[PDB]
């Protein structure tokens with residue numbers, strides 16, 4: 469059982485300049501609630517992107533995928549491939565390169581869509597594209613306490 473979870477702008481951007489280009493508290497609560505107690509699998513750049521006070525992610529087995537040798541990610545397990553990372557319920561938490569690896573092995577995608585306008589720039593990290601082999605159910609557009617509009621989508625593999 470492999471699930472992907474990500475937050476994207478409407479245009480499909482998930483990352484810019486080594487971080488996430490918006491702040492959405494309700495998404496962090498959603499992310500924490502869905503991943504707590506499970507293994508979280510991430511690419512090395514995404515590990516690097518975690519704020520120090522949240523690295524490693526507490527209450528979850530953190531697995532970092534890299535091509536480096538002897539990489540030290542304190543409090544995490546370091547592996548050399550996605551297959552190694554996956555040997556109950558496992559969540560792949562980004563970024564774009566690791567999503568692209570994990571999508572064919574996944575039965576579930578949990579997407580937060582953030583209604584901000586961010587035209588993709590050259591080096592952006594982009595969300596994977598889901599076709600009609602995926603069955604989605606969406607919540608309503610909601611307004612965060614901070615004022616940003618967002619909505620949750622849950623996709624299962626048909």
Ligand SMILES: NC(=O)c1ccc[n+]([C@@H]2O[C@H](COP(=O)([O-])OP(=O)(O)OC[C@H]3O[C@@H](n4cnc5c(N)ncnc54)[C@H](OP(=O)(O)O)[C@@H]3O)[C@@H](O)[C@H]2O)c1
Pocket residue numbers: 473474475476481482483484485486487488510511512513514515517533534535536548549550561562563564565566567569593
């Ligand atoms: N909005 C969201 O939901 C979300 C979620 C996660 C991350 N992000 C953002 O996305 C960006 C990071 O994503 P990214 O696509 O640049 O990077 P990434 O997928 O997190 O990590 C890329 C790294 O993964 C390793 N890697 C890639 N393919 C591999 C393979 N086949 N075997 C072994 N290791 C492999 C390499 O590590 P080495 O270079 O060490 O060899 C590579 O540099 C940041 O901006 C981050 O903030 C956003």
Ligand SMILES: CCc1nc(N)nc(N)c1OCCCOc1cccc(C[C@H](C(=O)O)C(F)F)c1
Pocket residue numbers: 473474475488495496497498499500514517518519522525526560561562579580
């Ligand atoms: C949280 C952004 C996000 N959103 C969805 N939907 N999917 C994702 N893959 C995703 O990026 C995961 C990589 C970044 O991760 C975090 C960075 C800072 C804080 C937290 C939450 C933290 C925790 O979880 O303890 C606590 F503050 F709540 C996660």
Ligand SMILES: [Br-]
Pocket residue numbers: 488490491
């Ligand atoms: Br963030």
Ligand SMILES: [Br-]
Pocket residue numbers: 491492493496
């Ligand atoms: Br926040």
Ligand SMILES: [Cl-]
Pocket residue numbers: 579581621
């Ligand atoms: Cl979407």
